[PDB]
């Protein structure tokens, strides 16, 4: 028979036998001190779904943040090469081009 | 003096309450809960038992008739059959051939050892928890007994204790109980006078000497068969003696908690749910004079192992300057790591140490001997033994620390996009302001 056993831990009896109480300790495979990853491996291995969740969380929120980079620093790119871009008679001036990254 | 605490209700856990009282050298005790007893308040609603049959001899009635009369006396049945001619071993008991009655009669009664073998049916409410807490401090070690609500203050060496009421209305008993010998039973018993027929409950007694009985055996005779005095008769057999092997095993070995049920009195011991406020008057012969007190000073923490496991898998040096050798004090300021010791030797070496446990990756916690104070950061590897004979030593408080490691990363990779994030706004706000100008 194999009994399951959490860190609440069990009873268990056999026969006349006095009661038996056993607790699982925090035994996990990964390094809580390693590279990025081994920490995730730890976390997972003693906390499961929290780490799956934790990890899906903020990983969703850096790509939420690093989408918002890209698309303020493309907003700001956009609106200041509009009026060269515009302009029939002109073209974006030999620094800017560079740094705003022009299209010619 | 008024302190107060709040130790977990969790037996052999012993809780460490320090106090600061600020004309003295602080002190810490410990307060072990050794039993806990949550005992209900039982109102008996009926007892059961087997029932006996009571089934006399056939009154048969040779050359004649018979009638039948009521009976005060429970179930209590009673037919005339009609045509009987019964053979005894020498011969037919009757002259008449067809003329004759038997008088078949039967009831029920209490059994003759339902003084010694009957189950009680009770509701359970509005339970009392005892504790038996263990106190100690200084030359003090001392076991006393309270209960624990409020009100009851309890001496210990001149010292008060109120140990406050359980941060809990919880009880392994349900509404309705049935108590039998040393075992207790979750059990929707029915109400007195409901009982059915081979169920439990098909006979009940308000008490065990009442006079008065239910039954509800579905007791009913039948016809003599053709020669024979015998008193033949079908009944449900004893619905008491169903459960007795029905019931299964008892609330003790299924009570949340960890509980351990007891009778006589019903009680559940040693439930490891909610937590108890303590509330300490301390007297001043209690504590020893600043004056007395080793001046504990430039106190540092190092960890030198530190294992998260279930016993005091941590261990640490304190050092500190003394002026004289003596007792302090010693506590940790943090429910992440609790020490095993309470007081701690001080002397001129200038270091000694301390072990702790934790369930944390990396527990800041902080610590003092005597007046003074320390934070101690430990890096805190796994244990590799699965499980073990006993219970956890620590809080399981399991997040670590913001100078941990995992924090540190999650800093690092946080302040670098949040960085980029505000390198982009600001680059967008001088952008549209300019081209707001234009």
């Known amino acids: 028979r194999i009994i399951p056993v959490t860190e609440e831990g069990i009873e268990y009896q056999w026969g006349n036998n006095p009661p038996v109480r056993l607790w699982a300790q925090l035994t996990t495979e990964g390094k809580p001190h390693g590279w990025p990853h081994e920490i995730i491996q730890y976390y997972y291995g003693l906390y499961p779904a929290a780490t799956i969740a934790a990890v899906s969380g903020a990983s969703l929120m850096a790509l939420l943040t690093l989408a918002a980079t890209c698309c303020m620093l493309a907003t700001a790119r956009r609106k200041c090469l509009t009026p060269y871009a515009l302009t029939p008679g002109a073209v974006v001036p030999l620094t800017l081009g560079l740094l705003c990254c022009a299209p010619r | ?438």
């Open chain 2, 1 to 438: 003096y008024e302190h107060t605490a709040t130790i977990p209700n969790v037996v052999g856990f012993p809780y460490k309450a320090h106090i600061e009282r600020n004309g003295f050298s602080p002190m810490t005790l410990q307060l072990e809960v050794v039993e806990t007893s949550l005992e209900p308040t039982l109102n008996l609603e009926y007892i059961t038992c087997e029932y006996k049959t009571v089934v006399p001899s056939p009154f048969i009635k040779c050359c004649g008739t018979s009638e039948c009369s009521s009976k005060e006396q429970p179930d209590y049945q009673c037919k005339v059959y009609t045509g009987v001619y019964p053979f005894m071993w020498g011969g037919a008991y009757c002259f008449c051939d067809s003329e004759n009655t038997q008088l078949s009669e039967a009831y029920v009664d209490r059994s003759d050892v339902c003084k010694h073998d009957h189950a009680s049916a009770y509701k359970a409410h509005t339970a009392s928890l005892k504790a038996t807490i263990r106190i100690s401090y200084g030359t003090i070690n001392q076991t006393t007994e309270a209960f624990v609500n409020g009100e009851h203050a309890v001496n210990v060496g001149g010292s008060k204790f109120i140990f406050g009421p359980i941060s809990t209305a919880w009880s392994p008993f349900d509404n309705k109980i049935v108590v039998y010998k040393d075992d207790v039973y979750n059990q929707d018993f029915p109400p007195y006078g409901s009982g059915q027929p081979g169920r439990f409950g098909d006979i009940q007694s308000r008490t065990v000497e009442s006079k008065d009985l239910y039954a509800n055996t579905a007791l009913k005779l039948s016809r003599p068969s053709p020669g024979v005095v015998h008193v033949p008769y079908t009944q449900t057999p004893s619905g008491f003696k169903y459960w007795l092997k029905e019931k299964g095993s008892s609330l003790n070995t299924k009570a949340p908690f960890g509980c351990k049920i007891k009778t006589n009195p019903v009680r559940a011991m040693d439930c490891a749910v909610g937590s108890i406020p303590v509330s300490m008057d301390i007297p001043d012969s209690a504590f020893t004079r600043v004056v007395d007190a080793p001046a504990v000073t430039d106190l540092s923490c190092q960890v030198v192992v530190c294992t998260h496991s279930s016993d005091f898998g941590g261990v640490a040096t304190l050092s500190y300057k003394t002026d004289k050798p003596g007792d302090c004090a010693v506590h940790s300021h943090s429910n992440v790591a609790t020490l095993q010791e309470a007081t701690v030797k001080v002397k001129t070496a200038g270091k000694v140490t301390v072990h702790f446990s934790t369930a944390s990756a990396s527990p800041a916690f902080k610590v003092s001997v005597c007046d003074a104070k320390t934070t101690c950061t430990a890096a805190c590897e796994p244990p590799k033994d699965h499980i073990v004979p006993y219970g956890a030593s620590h809080n399981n408080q399991v997040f670590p620390d913001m100078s941990g490691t995992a924090m540190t990363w999650v800093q690092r990779l946080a302040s670098g996009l949040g960085g980029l994030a505000l390198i982009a706004v600001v680059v967008l706000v001088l952008v549209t302001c300019i081209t707001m100008r234009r």
